C-alpha cells in the first residue's frame, strides 16, 4: 500500500510495585508509521497475553536503519494468511536487498495471484537465504544461474506527436 521501515517497538506491560519494569519486550515492526506499528504491536500483544491496549506500556521505538545496505541478498518467507476458503501457512523465497521490497512484491503476488487481502494475513518469518543450496524455488534457481547475456527482440519507442512519417522497425 506504501513503503515500510524496519521499526523496533519495545514494550514493558505496565509496571506495578510488585513488578516495577516488566522486561521491556520488543518487536521489530515493518511499517510506515510508528503509530500503526504500535497498533499492530498491540494487535499481536493481545494474541500473546491477557492484555489490552491500555493494560500495558511501550518502552521505545527504533527504526532499525542500516549501516551497510550495499550487500544484495536472498530471502526466506513463512506466511500465516487467510484466504477466501483456506487459511494456511506458506514458505516462498525472494531475492532482495531489503525485506520491505519482498513485502511489496509479496502482496502484489498474493493480492494479484491469489487475490489475498492483507487484513487477515500475518507474515511469520523471514529467514533470509544465504547459499546456493538454501533454495527450493526454481525461479530463484534461475537467478542462481550463470551469465545470461542476450539481445532484445521487439524494441518499442514512443511517437513524438502521434505519428511517424514511417512504419518503423522493432530492432533494438
Amino acid at each position: 500500500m506504501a513503503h515500510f521501515k524496519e521499526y523496533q517497538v519495545i514494550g514493558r506491560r505496565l509496571p506495578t510495585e510488585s513488578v516495577p519494569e516488566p522486561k521491556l519486550f520488543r518487536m521489530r515492526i515493518f511499517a510506515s508509521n510508528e503509530v500503526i506499528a504500535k497498533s499492530r504491536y498491540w494487535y499481536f500483544l493481545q494474541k500473546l497475553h491477557k492484555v489490552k491496549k491500555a493494560s500495558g506500556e511501550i518502552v521505545s521505538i527504533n527504526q532499525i536503519n542500516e549501516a551497510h545496505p550495499t550487500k544484495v541478498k536472498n530471502f526466506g518467507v513463512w506466511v500465516r494468511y487467510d484466504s477466501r476458503s483456506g487459511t494456511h501457512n506458506m514458505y516462498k523465497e525472494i531475492r532482495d536487498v531489503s525485506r520491505v521490497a519482498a513485502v511489496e512484491t509479496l502482496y502484489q503476488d498474493m493480492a494479484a495471484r491469489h487475490r489475498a487481502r492483507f487484513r487477515s494475513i500475518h507474515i511469520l518469518k523471514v529467514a533470509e537465504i544465504e547459499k546456493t543450496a538454501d533454495v527450493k524455488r526454481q525461479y530463484v534457481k534461475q537467478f542462481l544461474t550463470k551469465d545470461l547475456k542476450f539481445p532484445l527482440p521487439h524494441r518499442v519507442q514512443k511517437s513524438t506527436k502521434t505519428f511517424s512519417y514511417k512504419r518503423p522497425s522493432t530492432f533494438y
Binding site: T70, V72, R95, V97, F143, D147, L148, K149, F150, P151, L152, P153, R155, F171, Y172
Partner: protein, 136 residues
C-alpha cells in the same frame, strides 16, 4: 554449405555493461551493471557518472552494446577501477547520435544575429552550392 541466418540479433546484455540510463536523475548518464537482480531490475553503478551502487527498472534503462569486463560482486573502487580499465565513453562519443544530440543542442545555442549569419551562410554557402552546381 549455407545455413545463412539474416537478422533477429541486436544489442546484447551483460553484467558490467555500461548502459545509457535512459531516464531519471541521470537521464542519460552511463553506468556499469554490477549485478543482475531479476528480469525487471539489475544492480548498477556509474562511478564515472558518480551515480551510486543502485538498481533500476530494466524497462526504465536502455542499453548500450558497449560491453566491458567486470568482476561481479565488487565495490566502487573495483568498479571505477574497471572503468579505469574502461575509459570508453569516447566511443558513444564516437556514436554520431550522441553527437547529434550535441548538434540539436548547438542548434539550440544560437543568437538571432548568429542565426541571421546562418541564413546568409545558406545564401553564400548555398550560393557556392549553386556555383558548384551552377553549370556543374
Amino acid at each position: 554449405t549455407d545455413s545463412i541466418v539474416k537478422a533477429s540479433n541486436w544489442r546484447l546484455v551483460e553484467v558490467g555493461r555500461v548502459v545509457l540510463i535512459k531516464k531519471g536523475q541521470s537521464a542519460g548518464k552511463l553506468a556499469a551493471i554490477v549485478e543482475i537482480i531479476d528480469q525487471k531490475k539489475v544492480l548498477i553503478d556509474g562511478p564515472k557518472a558518480g551515480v551510486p551502487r543502485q538498481a533500476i527498472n530494466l524497462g526504465q534503462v536502455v542499453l548500450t552494446p558497449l560491453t566491458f569486463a567486470l568482476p561481479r560482486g565488487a565495490r566502487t573502487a573495483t568498479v571505477s577501477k574497471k572503468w579505469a580499465a574502461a575509459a570508453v565513453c569516447e566511443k558513444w562519443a564516437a556514436s554520431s547520435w550522441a553527437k547529434k544530440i550535441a548538434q540539436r543542442e548547438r542548434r539550440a545555442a544560437l543568437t538571432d544575429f548568429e542565426r541571421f549569419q546562418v541564413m546568409v551562410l545558406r545564401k553564400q554557402k548555398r550560393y557556392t552550392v549553386k556555383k558548384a552546381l551552377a553549370k556543374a
